């Protein structure tokens, strides 16, 4: 009975919209909340305002046809693919084939739709967009990693490597802030590099003194700190106050090891809201940190020569 999917139906026949709603009720696996529009314009507003999990789109509407509609649909950057199923007229398959090249996941012929066919198409559209998104992110993640490896092979300057790392990581994660924290001999730390958008307070020029001496045992042993919400993570009053002071709400911290030594931290922040850090994100940061370590070893070995 709990809503498990939201579907937007855009179709100028109210009776057909009601038919598809009923058909969806037959699905034992999901509970659908259905948004309804009779015009392309209202359908676009509902898509933008309410983010449905899938769309059933009539190939012909009073104000737009399906192709014009698809063209105006902007996906979220979180999922740059459109969970759209085109419903086309009998004998009009060719138009629907064009709709798939333009981003639709599937199509149905209006007259031949059964409850089962509908559940199938909707299931498929949602699953396929999820699959396309996963593949998309792997390609991006491999690009970022491969780029750092190339810079190291080319023996480029450490500063450029850190800068590329912080920028590309922030862009990939869509994070509010990413920075590199370097430990000095006296076990003090300074922020060396920062990439920050509009959501956080810049920290590069506003840092005082601060813990590595006393509890970097975990960082030295390569462990990461993943905090979804600073208020529910059980930190000390001081630590929470410090992070809140810079509007940090979620915190992901990965150590940078040079040989066996704790050189610094690669840190990611969300400042706008809590954020659950995901396995693929954590693995990427860990791999980048390892690469930074390799770059550090290169620079030191190069220095001694």
Ligand X SMILES: *[C@H](C)[C@H]1/C(=C/c2[nH]c(/C=C3N=C(/C=C4/NC(=O)C(CC)=C4C)C(C)=C\3CCC(=O)O)c(CCC(=O)O)c2C)NC(=O)[C@@H]1C
Q: Which of residues 64-103 bind a copy of itself (CB under 8 A)?
A: 93, 96-97, 100
Q: Least distance (Å) from a copy of itself to the CB of residue 288?
A: 10
Footprint on this chain of ligand X (rule: CB under 6 A): 181, 191, 203, 207-208, 210-211, 215, 225, 236, 238-239, 242, 246, 251, 253, 265, 267
Q: Least distance (Å) from a copy of itself to the CB of residue 188?
A: 26
The DSSP bridge partners found for residue 262 are 257
Among a copy of itself, ligand X, Mg ion, none, partner that 212 touches (CB below 5 to 8 angstroms by kind): none
Taking CB under 8 A as the criterion, the residue among 114, 174, 221, 241 binding a copy of itself is 114
Q: Least distance (Å) from a copy of itself to the CB of residue 183?
A: 18
Residue 74 in 3-state DSSP?
coil
Site string for a copy of itself, 248-277 (x = CB under 8 A): ---------x--------------------
Q: Least distance (Å) from a copy of itself to the CB of residue 70?
A: 17
Site string for Mg ion, 202-231 (x = CB under 5 A): ------------------------------
Residue nearest to ligand X (CB): 238
- In angstroms, what CA-CA distances link 223 with 102, 256, 265, 267? 45, 10, 11, 13
Residue of 16, 127, 162, 136 lying closest to 78 (CA atoms): 136
Among Mg ion, ligand X, a copy of itself, none, partner that 133 touches (CB below 5 to 8 angstroms by kind): none
Binding flag, residue 12, Mg ion (CB under 5 A): yes
The 3-class SS string of 214-227 reads: HHCHHHHCCCCEEE
CA atoms of 108 and 3, how far apart (whole Å): 24
Q: Least distance (Å) from ligand X to the CB of residue 216?
A: 7
Site string for Mg ion, 47-76 (x = CB under 5 A): -----------x-x----------------
Q: Which residues in this chain contact Mg ion in the complex, by CB under 5 A? A: 12, 58, 60, 124
Q: Which residues in this chain contact a copy of itself in the complex, by CB under 8 A? A: 93, 96-97, 100, 106-107, 109, 112, 114, 116-117, 119-120, 123-124, 128, 131-132, 134-135, 138-139, 141-142, 145-146, 149-150, 152-153, 155, 257, 283, 287, 290-291, 293-294, 297-298, 301-302, 304-305
């Amino acid at each position: 009975p709990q809503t498990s999917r939201v579907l937007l139906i855009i179709d100028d026949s109210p009776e057909d919209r009601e038919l598809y709603r009923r058909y969806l009720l037959r699905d034992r696996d999901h509970s659908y909340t259905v948004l309804e529009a009779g015009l392309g314009r209202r359908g676009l507003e509902l898509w933008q305002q309410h983010h449905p999990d899938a769309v059933l789109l009539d190939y012909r509407l009073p104000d737009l046809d399906g192709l014009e509609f698809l063209a105006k649909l902007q996906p979220p950057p979180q999922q740059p693919y459109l969970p759209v199923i085109m419903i086309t007229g009998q004998g009009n398959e060719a138009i629907a084939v064009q709709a798939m090249k333009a981003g639709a996941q599937d199509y149905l012929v209006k007259e031949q739709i059964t409850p089962e066919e509908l559940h199938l198409a909707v299931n498929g559209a949602i699953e396929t967009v999820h699959l396309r998104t996963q593949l998309h992110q792997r390609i991006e993640r491999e690009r970022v990693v491969s780029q750092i490896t190339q810079k190291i092979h080319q023996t480029l300057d450490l500063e450029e490597i850190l800068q590329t790392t912080v920028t590309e990581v922030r862009q990939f994660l869509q994070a509010d802030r990413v920075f590199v924290y370097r430990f000095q001999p006296d076990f003090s730390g300074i922020v060396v590099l920062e990439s920050v958008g509009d959501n956080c307070v810049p920290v590069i020029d506003a840092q005082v003194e601060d813990f590595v001496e006393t509890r970097g045992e975990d960082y030295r042993q390569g462990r990461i700190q993943a905090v979804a919400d600073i208020y529910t993570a059980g930190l000390t009053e001081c630590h929470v106050n410090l992070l809140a002071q810079f509007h940090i709400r979620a915190n992901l911290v990965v150590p940078i090891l040079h040989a066996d030594a704790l050189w610094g931290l690669l840190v990611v922040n969300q400042c706008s809201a809590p954020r659950q850090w995901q396995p693929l994100e954590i693995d990427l940061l860990k791999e980048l940190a390892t690469q930074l370590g390799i770059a550090l070893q290169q620079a030191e070995l190069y220095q001694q020569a």
